[PDB]
Design a protein around this ligand. Structure first.
Ligand SMILES: Nc1ncnc2c1ncn2[C@@H]1O[C@H](COP(=O)(O)OP(=O)(O)OP(=O)(O)O)[C@@H](O)[C@H]1O
Ligand SMILES: [Ca+2]
Ligand SMILES: [Ca+2]
Ligand SMILES: [Ca+2]
Ligand SMILES: [Ca+2]
Ligand SMILES: [Ca+2]
Ligand SMILES: [Ca+2]
Ligand SMILES: [Ca+2]
Lengths: 196, 361
């Protein structure tokens, strides 16, 4: 238990009073003098991995680069590493990370007008309002997790085609499945009106 | 107050708020101006949709900001239209390509402080952000985006510039090649929605073959490799060997007439330019990042190609984090959230005292 161990916890290095237990959901920086070990838990998140690596470079730089940095994968520790501690122990401890899923309030949804009349074609942001829904065009409501494509009763087949393709590309650029709901002018479900 | 993170790419801007786990704004890095017949410029999806009346330009070429007037429009759009924030209220983290010239980083800093009046800023190297987000200080990053592919060896936190390789082939070339080979099947892709179809097919149906010649033989002898894409109107496009011919271009640039080594050989060449004492660490830590590394099969193919080239007793490992499409941005989101990094941000008062060169110190 001779090396100094820092437990990464919610964006900070916390020096462990009594090191030796390592949780599979977390990361640890182990300062063993001429050697600095990154201990990367197999269930840890990117924010924890990042702080460990960045902190190891800082500590090495503080000692003018004179330490060797080794990366340890949690659960596959070499014999060299386990023997540094009185009682090395692998646990299921997982401190929650600092990153949060993207969330939009309703005042943050965006509304897009889709127009296509011959070679007169464009997309264009418009104000988020029921007033903007024209019955001769197509409109996209972006709520982040759900994309509604509202097709006016008088919109062209080309505008409906374009609106769905644009919605597909929004879903493609956002990790995780975003639901695309095709909505018809005059039969809007309650879920759609709530976005206004 | 909360930091902003902007990862400006050749093809896509990725922007959002530090602490988010994904960029909330992702839009094309394109500026359109209605030249020669009062809003005088359009950005992003609106601009690309109006190509018929706008002159479109990409301000970032092969990862390097080249057109500063249009880049200012991109940043203005990012702050005010996409994120809807006041830049003078938010420290802003920007990213930069490998081998970005000093004068370029200084101009980025000048614009952020003098045009947008940010209270603080930082400029991070894209490849280092991706490597740290994987929990590594040492490794070789393969960053393949929309306009450029780099191999960036990094040793204990610092990129090794003499061994960085650049290949001017990435996602936009693959889109264009898929469009070419699908047009040879008799399709036409001219409208904005048609070009989006090609992009969607590339990202949903394509893959890297483990052995290209064997896969071509399979595709010739059966229809087991065909897969279909349904258009919004119910039409179906079916492709077979186009699925893997398209990204094969990364390994065989001659498919698009480029006389260059493929990405497996540039990786090997980059490792060989490093001191023999660190090559073992690079072989075991090939980290992929960027949208063009998302093809199913690419890690397994790289593992096979590098293993064929590498010396005896080396361990070859390709790391493809599931979040690698946006690993640069996510790395920046973490960085801009971390307490211990606050001392390394440039403040407006320091800029006022020292000028743009403070971004190096
Ligand atoms: N799942 C996928 N499969 C294949 N390609 C993809 C996938 N997702 C995105 N892409 C491609 O990745 C490219 C965009 O990647 P990225 O955002 O890393 O590039 P960039 O930062 O804009 O460009 P660069 O890094 O070259 O300056 C586009 O060509 C896009 O089609
Ligand atoms: Ca003890
Ligand atoms: Ca954790
Ligand atoms: Ca060192
Ligand atoms: Ca219309
Ligand atoms: Ca929602
Ligand atoms: Ca999605
Ligand atoms: Ca990029």
């Amino acid at each position: 238990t001779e090396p100094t161990v820092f437990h990464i916890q919610k964006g900070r290095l916390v020096r462990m009073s009594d090191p030796g237990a390592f949780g599979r959901g977390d990361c640890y920086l182990v300062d063993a003098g001429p050697k600095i070990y990154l201990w990367i838990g197999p269930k840890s998140t990117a924010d924890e991995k990042f702080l460990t690596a960045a902190s190891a470079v800082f500590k090495d730089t503080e000692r003018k680069g004179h330490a060797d940095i080794d990366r340890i994968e949690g659960g596959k520790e070499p014999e060299e590493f386990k023997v540094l501690f009185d009682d090395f122990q692998l646990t299921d401890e997982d401190t929650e990370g600092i990153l949060r899923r993207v969330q939009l309030e309703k005042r943050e949804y965006k509304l897009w007008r889709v127009h296509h009349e011959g070679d007169d074609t464009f997309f264009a942001e418009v104000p988020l309002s029921r007033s903007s829904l024209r019955s001769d065009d197509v409109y996209l409501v972006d709520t982040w997790d759900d994309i509604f494509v509202w097709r006016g009763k008088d919109a062209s087949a080309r505008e409906k085609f374009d609106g769905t393709m644009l919605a597909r590309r929004y879903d493609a650029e956002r990790v995780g499945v975003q639901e695309i709901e095709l909505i018809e002018d005059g039969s809007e479900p309650e879920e759609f009106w709530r976005s206004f | 107050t909360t930091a902003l993170v902007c990862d400006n790419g050749s093809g896509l801007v990725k922007a959002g708020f530090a602490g988010d786990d994904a960029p909330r704004a992702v839009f094309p890095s394109i500026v359109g101006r209605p030249r020669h017949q009062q809003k005088d410029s359009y950005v992003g999806d609106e601009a690309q949709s109006k190509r018929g009346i706008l002159t479109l330009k990409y301000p970032i070429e092969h990862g390097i900001i080249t057109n500063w007037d249009d880049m200012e429009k991109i940043w203005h759009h990012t702050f005010y239209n996409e994120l809807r924030v006041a830049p003078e209220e938010h420290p802003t983290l920007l990213t930069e390509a490998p081998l970005n010239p000093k004068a370029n980083r200084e101009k980025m800093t000048q614009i952020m402080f003098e045009t947008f009046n940010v209270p603080a800023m930082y400029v991070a190297i894209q490849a280092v952000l991706s490597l740290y987000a994987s929990g590594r200080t040492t490794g070789i990053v393969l960053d393949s985006g929309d306009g450029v592919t780099h191999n960036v060896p990094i040793y204990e936190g610092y990129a090794l510039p003499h061994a960085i390789m650049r290949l001017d082939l990435a996602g936009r070339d693959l889109t264009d090649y898929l469009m070419k080979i699908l047009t040879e099947r008799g399709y036409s892709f001219v409208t904005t929605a048609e070009r989006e179809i090609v992009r969607d097919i590339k990202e949903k149906l394509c893959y890297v073959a483990l052995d290209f010649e064997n896969e071509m033989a399979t595709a010739a002898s059966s229809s087991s490799l065909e897969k279909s894409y349904e258009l919004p109107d119910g039409q179906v496009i079916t492709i077979g060997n186009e699925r893997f011919r398209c990204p094969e271009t990364l390994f065989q640039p001659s498919f698009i007439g480029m006389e260059s080594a493929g990405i497996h050989e540039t990786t090997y060449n980059s490792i060989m330019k490093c001191d023999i004492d660190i090559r073992k660490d690079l072989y075991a830590n090939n980290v992929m990042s960027g949208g063009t590394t998302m093809y199913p099969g690419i890690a397994d193919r790289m593992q096979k190609e590098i293993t064929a080239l590498a010396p005896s007793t080396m361990k070859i490992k390709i790391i493809a984090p599931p979040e690698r499409k946006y690993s640069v941005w996510i790395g920046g989101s973490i960085l801009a959230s971390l307490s211990t990094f606050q001392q390394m941000w440039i403040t407006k008062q320091e800029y006022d005292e020292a000028g743009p060169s403070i971004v190096h110190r």
